[PDB]
């Protein structure tokens, strides 16, 4: 575990992270995809061997000794608000189990279902609160990755609010 487990946020490409493992915002079929998933495919393509997994689950595949945790959030274009919320919470719970099992001291994580799976809605708060619910009981250093300057400020404020 980390000496003083923390949350941090950075605005940059998660493929350039400084953590001991990465969470991919994956599709259920293990395809290269777009956005975070395509950057993850270009950096760790070996990790997409048998990475397909259902919605609300996470599947870890090694790239050398570097773990890639493929976490599949719901696409809110297809799910109801109610069922999507349940699947989004579940995907983060499975990420917490994988991070624990791997024994890593740090993890890079994107906000699941906030991009092309958002169904056109701002889900910063919804996705971040499910991230916290899952990861609060883990002792890894968590570094959240985002691309938007306004999202960086709101995520940083939410972390600081809990002190």
Residues that bind Cl ion (CB under 5 A): 12-13, 115, 117, 146-148, 151
Closest CA to 159 of 143, 148, 147, 146: 143
Q: Which is nearer to Cl ion, 52 or 102 (CB)?
A: 52
Q: How far apart are the C-alpha atoms of 127 and 101, rounded to whole Å?
A: 23
Torsion angle in degrees (nearest 10) through CA of 22, 28, 32, 36: -40
Q: How far is the CB of 4 from Cl ion (least distance, A)?
A: 27
Q: Consult the annotation and say whether 116 binds a ligand.
A: yes
User: Considering the complex, what minimum distance in angstroms separates the CB of residue 117 from Cl ion?
Assistant: 4
- Tell me whether residue 106 or residue 118 sits nearer to Cl ion (CB atom): 118
Nearest alpha carbon to residue 131 among 23, 1, 19: 23
Report the nearest approach of Cl ion to the CB of residue 79 (Å).
Answer: 13
CB nearer to Cl ion: give 93 or 147.
147
Query: At residue 50, what are phi and psi to the nearest 5 degrees?
Result: 55, 45
The alpha helices in 10-162, defined as continuous H runs, are: 36-43, 81-102, 124-135, 149-161
Q: Which is nearer to Cl ion, 17 or 138 (CB)?
A: 17
Q: Pairing mode, if any, of strands 7-11 and 141-146?
A: parallel
13 annotated as a binding-site residue: yes
Answer yes or no: is 35 a known binding residue: yes
Q: How far is the CB of 13 from Cl ion (least distance, A)?
A: 4
Binding region: 13, 27, 35, 115-117
């Amino acid at each position: 575990g980390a000496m003083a487990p923390s949350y941090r946020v950075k605005r940059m490409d998660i493929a350039k992270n400084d953590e001991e493992c990465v969470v991919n915002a994956a599709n259920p079929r293990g395809l290269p995809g777009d956005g975070v998933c395509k950057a993850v495919y270009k950096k760790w393509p070996e990790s997409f061997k048998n990475s397909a997994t259902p919605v609300g689950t996470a599947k870890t595949v090694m790239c050398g000794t570097y773990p890639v945790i493929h976490a599949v959030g719901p696409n809110f274009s297809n799910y109801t608000e109610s069922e999507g919320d349940r699947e989004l919470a579940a995907a983060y719970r499975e990420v917490a189990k994988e991070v624990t099992r791997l024994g890593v001291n740090s993890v890079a994580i994107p906000l699941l279902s906030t991009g092309v799976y958002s169904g056109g809605k701002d889900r910063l708060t919804q996705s971040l609160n499910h991230l916290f619910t899952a990861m609060d009981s883990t002792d890894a250093d968590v570094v959240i990755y985002c691309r938007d300057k306004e999202w960086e400020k709101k995520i940083s404020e939410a972390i600081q609010m809990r002190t």
